Structure 1
Amino acid sequence: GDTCNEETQNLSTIYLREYQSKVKRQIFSDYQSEVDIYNRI
């Protein structure tokens, strides 16, 4: 009933949230700069 359409919107948003994190893992990782831990410690 209302559960069928809420459930649909809810399984759709979880599928979307997960694909958006893969996209952020691609584009934000270009900004990740490694630290020389021995020098800073």
Structure 2
Amino acid sequence: GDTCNEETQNLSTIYLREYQSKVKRQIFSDYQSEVDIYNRIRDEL
């Protein structure tokens, strides 16, 4: 029955994409540069 196997497939992929988000929160955060919001806005709005 396809439904068993494509369900298995679909749940394993979900499980994988979610673990890939924990890794991206680790390696992509080294590139995050913080903004001085007060001087950005200090010209208008």
Displacement over 6 Å in runs of 4+: none
If the length of structure 2 is used for normalisation, what is the TM-score? 0.88
Unaligned segments of structure 1, at least 5 residues: none
For each residue in 1:1-41, what CA deviation from the matched residue of structure 2 results, as whole angstroms up to 9, or x when unmatched? 10000000000000000000110000000000110000111
Q: Percent identity among equivalent residues? A: 100
User: What is the number of residues matched between the two proteins?
Assistant: 41
If the length of structure 1 is used for normalisation, what is the TM-score? 0.96
Largest Rg, 1 or 2: 2
Cα RMSD of the aligned pairs, angstroms, is 0.4
